[PDB]
Amino acid sequence: KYFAPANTHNNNLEGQAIVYQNKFLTINGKKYYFDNNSKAITGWQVIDDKKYYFNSNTAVADTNLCTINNEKYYFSYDGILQNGYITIGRLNFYFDSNNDSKMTTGVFKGPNGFEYFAPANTYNNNLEGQAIVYQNKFLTINGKKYYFDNKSKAVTGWQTIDGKKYYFNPNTAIAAMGWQAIDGKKYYFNPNTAIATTGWQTIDGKKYYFNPNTAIAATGWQAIDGKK
């Protein structure tokens, strides 16, 4: 309850309880929001299309990197829940906007491209969510494959790895699988290995020929090994 200062509401005395419905109140930089019953609300709340988390013991607008149910969140200086790419100290963290802004791990686009925010105790990193240096390696997360360069950044398009050609989506860096149309040309990528198919191939009981050099699906009249 808000034992308001003198003359705040209906000439209330110092420390008198007043009617305070559906409005914010800032006291010594601490924020509260009151519902229609002149009660300070608590818990997860949404006001003016903005998400707040009022502590269950203080009803104060928690405004910083703070753990909830063993999951970190980042509330901005004035309480509002914010999501995206966020730097803390010298460590970068990502908060999926679609996942209640909950701290996640994966590969996500920061200012210089896609980065690997790894779980705890990964290849060289023990802090969960932190960007780790993944230089010139492949990574598979829940089946999705990516490759990273010397800048620990993902890529997209055509790539030759260990003598095998792969195609990664420029917009998502996901390895191509199955039938794909790239720049008007049809290519078939192995569903399991994502390797572009070359030469004669039998798919779904139908024979196909892929150019050994370009892997482009054969169309129209074609002369192969002296046969049309």
Query: What is the sign, positive or negative, of the torsion defined by CA atoms of 205, 206, 211, 217?
Result: negative
Resolution in units of Å:
3.2
Q: Tokens in use for 192?
A: 């399991």
Q: Is 30 exposed, middle or buried (0-12, 13-18, 19+ CB in 10 A)?
A: middle
- How many angstroms separate the first and last alpha carbons of the chain? 89
Q: What 3-state DSSP class applies to 196? A: strand
- What is the rounded distance in angstroms from the CA atom of residue 50 to the CA atom of residue 126? 33
Contacting residues for 120 by C-beta, under 8 A, at least 6 apart: 126, 127, 128
d(CA 222, CA 212): 13
Buried b / exposed e along 45-82 (16+ C-beta atoms within 10 A): eeeeeebbbbeeeebbbbbeeeeeeeebbbbeeebebb
Identify the helix (H) or strand (E) that includes residue 46: strand 43-47
Separation of alpha carbons 219 and 202, rounded Å = 15
Distance CA 94, CA 186 (A): 36
Method: cryo-EM
Which token pair is 149?
């360069």
